[PDB]
Enzyme design. Structure first.
Site, short mmCIF file in Angstrom:
data_model
loop_
_atom_site.label_atom_id
_atom_site.label_comp_id
_atom_site.label_asym_id
_atom_site.label_seq_id
_atom_site.Cartn_x
_atom_site.Cartn_y
_atom_site.Cartn_z
N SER A 18 -0.70 15.61 -11.84
CA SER A 18 -1.04 15.32 -13.38
C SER A 18 -1.13 16.52 -14.19
CB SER A 18 -1.95 14.32 -13.41
OG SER A 18 -2.44 14.12 -14.83
N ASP A 77 0.77 -1.20 0.03
CA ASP A 77 0.05 0.05 -0.02
C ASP A 77 0.91 1.20 -0.11
OD1 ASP A 77 -1.92 1.80 0.39
OD2 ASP A 77 -2.26 1.24 2.38
#
Length: 330
Positions: free
Chosen positions: A199, A35
């Site tokens: 992004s 994770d």
């Protein structure tokens, strides 16, 4: 040193991935959910409330000659999905794909919430976010990657998750045969303890790319892609019959649909998520309403590039003094 381990989807939907991890002496192999959105290595154990264990493999520290109680240390964690677990702490030897850390904090669950009990395939979590998020008190503990970093040939790990197929976590090296083209690296902020990056925009299907900054986290422990409501609306508007359902808890779409791809920007590069990766199947057995793999982050407080996005790429988690993230197509 290096390590290399195969990671395998837990079910036919890629809801999560499990990677075998050796703990203790002799080795006890548990299948852990790696994770990158958390920083605790915790396991089902001989200490876990018996009614909360239902098929998981447990770590028994009393059977490990290298286990030592970390005296006074406790841990307690709550995840973005509302699940939680807590317990005490041992140190022991932990190996992943041939890479060994001695003295790793292994957090032994005394209690786990129902979603963990109900998932017999996940024996615990192995956190790979920054150690500043580790929950052990009163002495915060380091992640497996942090402990291994100095010994690694290169201070990196990579995630290569498969679509409906096994993939690979590598530690300490970049497998140049595992991706196409070049790797585009992008800046990371560690201020929230996550692999947080920005992004450069998105496209829906064959549509034009929209240049816009989307701050979010690379999170292998989250199944879906969670993005701003504007972006998610633009995606689902291209699917006939798709709608946001408050009763189901997100966007659903007719199972008869063919989904468009979704592209996200990494600097000047582009990662394309095929439409099929966005199909999470019937909302309930036999339903013709299917659950979408792109969902709004509006109720979370952060955008999350979970498995839906990450499995479309070869992802480098660069733990150099200034961390960065790399993405390549594959």
């Amino acid at each position: 040193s290096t390590g290399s381990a195969t990671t395998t989807p837990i079910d036919s939907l890629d809801d999560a991935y499990i990677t075998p991890v050796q703990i203790g002496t002799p080795a006890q192999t548990l299948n852990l959910d790696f994770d990158t959105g958390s920083s605790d290595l915790w396991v089902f154990s001989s200490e876990t409330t018996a009614s909360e264990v239902d098929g998981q493999t447990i770590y028994t520290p009393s059977k490990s000659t290298t286990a030592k109680l970390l005296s006074g240390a406790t841990w307690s964690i709550s995840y973005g999905d509302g699940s939680s677990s807590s317990g005490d702490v041992y140190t022991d030897t932990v190996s992943v794909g041939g890479l060994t850390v001695t003295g790793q904090a292994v957090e032994s669950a005394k209690k786990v919430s129902s979603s963990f009990t109900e998932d017999s395939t996940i024996d615990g979590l192995l956190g790979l976010a920054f150690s500043t998020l580790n929950t052990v008190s009163p002495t915060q503990q380091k992640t497996f990657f942090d402990n291994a970093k100095a010994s690694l040939d290169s201070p990196v790990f990579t995630a290569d998750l498969g679509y409906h197929a096994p993939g690979t976590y590598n530690f300490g090296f970049i497998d140049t045969t595992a991706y196409t083209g070049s790797i585009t690296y992008t800046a990371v902020s560690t201020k929230q303890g996550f692999w947080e990056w920005t992004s450069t925009g998105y496209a829906v299907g064959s549509g034009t790319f929209k240049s816009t900054s989307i701050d979010g986290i690379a999170d292998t422990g989250t199944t879906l892609l969670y993005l701003p409501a504007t972006v998610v609306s633009a995606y689902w508007a291209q699917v006939s019959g798709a709608k946001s359902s408050s009763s189901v808890g997100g966007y659903v779409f007719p199972c008869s649909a063919t989904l468009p791809s979704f592209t996200f920007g990494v600097g000047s590069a582009r990662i394309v998520i095929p439409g099929d990766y966005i199909d999470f199947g019937p909302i309930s057995t036999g339903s013709s309403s299917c659950f979408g793999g792109i969902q709004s982050s509006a109720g979370i407080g952060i955008n999350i590039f979970g498995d839906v996005a990450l499995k479309a790429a070869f992802v480098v988690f660069n733990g150099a003094t200034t961390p960065t993230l790399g993405f390549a197509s594959k």
